[PDB]
């Protein structure tokens, strides 16, 4: 895997170039955010059990056929594996948020997830609804203050929303 600092280095080694003066000034801004990025990863991780469970609770209220006999989440092994997957996706979205690059997200979670759910019969349109419910529980948790100093984080919540949309289109 490689983060956002290692991303521009790998793009520059393949050209055989030193980094520019403009490119160092663009990596100073990524360090200048710095603490605001670590606030989003702190808020998402600290409420990780309640984000997964209460957005599984709201999925079975709107699609109650998934827990009927003959549904894809009806049994204890088949329900516990469903909550386990929703915690796997929230894990690698927080990994992609601390790194600034969606490379650990697809190389270790997403590549082969569509092929897995097509061999098992898991409804892929219902997985993306569970992904989109953890999204707006987390982008509403991102832009509340709650012991953070007041400022503008609207550029880092568009990046966190883009990692949830990436995980949702790799399964739908």
């Amino acid at each position: 895997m490689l983060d956002a600092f290692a991303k521009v280095v790998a793009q520059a080694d393949a050209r055989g170039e030193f980094l520019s003066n403009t490119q160092i000034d663009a990596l100073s801004k990524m360090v200048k955010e710095g603490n605001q990025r670590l606030d989003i990863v702190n808020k998402v991780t600290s409420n990780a059990s309640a984000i997964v469970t209460n957005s599984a609770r709201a999925l079975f209220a709107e699609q109650p056929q998934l827990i009927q006999p003959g549904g894809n989440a009806y049994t204890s092994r088949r329900m516990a594996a469903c909550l386990r997957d929703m915690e796997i996706v929230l894990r690698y979205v927080s990994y992609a948020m601390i790194a600034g690059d969606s490379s650990v997200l697809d190389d270790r979670c997403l590549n082969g997830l569509r092929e897995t759910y097509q061999a098992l019969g898991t409804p892929g349109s219902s997985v993306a609804v569970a992904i989109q419910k953890m999204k707006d529980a987390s982008v509403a948790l991102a832009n509340d203050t709650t012991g953070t100093p007041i400022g503008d984080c609207s550029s880092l919540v568009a990046e966190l929303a883009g990692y949830f949309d990436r995980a949702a289109v790799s399964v739908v």
């Binding site: 393949a14 050209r15 993306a128 609804v129 739908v172």
Partner: protein, 177 residues
Amino acid sequence: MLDAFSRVVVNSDAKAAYVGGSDLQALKSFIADGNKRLDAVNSIVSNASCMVSDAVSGMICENPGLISPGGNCYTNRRMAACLRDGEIILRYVSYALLAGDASVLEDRCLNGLKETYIALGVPTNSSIRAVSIMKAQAVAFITNTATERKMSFAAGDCTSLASEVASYFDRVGAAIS
């Protein structure tokens, strides 16, 4: 193949939602900035022959082992195919700029282009540099910063269209890698 308007339709169809209110304003903005998009697609297809020849020549000038015996662009059959491999890639990028969505570039061009280039034996580092040269040419004609041509436009800013077409060219390098 989806355009910009039919992309928000397949996003609304996934949740049985009508298109209206919040989503129609981002599409009314597409119509209001729509004269710029036709005025920018015209700038690329008016120079589409000089763009391709200068991209394959500049790929060769920096890496002159490609025209040696053992290089991929050695003979005349191979050089004429490399001049045509890039003329199609530029054609599909100008479709995605006209549509406003990268679905025609991914469906008809990039899906399968990777295993095309590993069966033939095309060097992916050299083909990325030929795309990179076309990216610099496309932003220069859109933002009128071309050092060899001065196209006439109305006055205004089109940075969002140049940052859009730059993201289409980076999908070409990420696919074949």
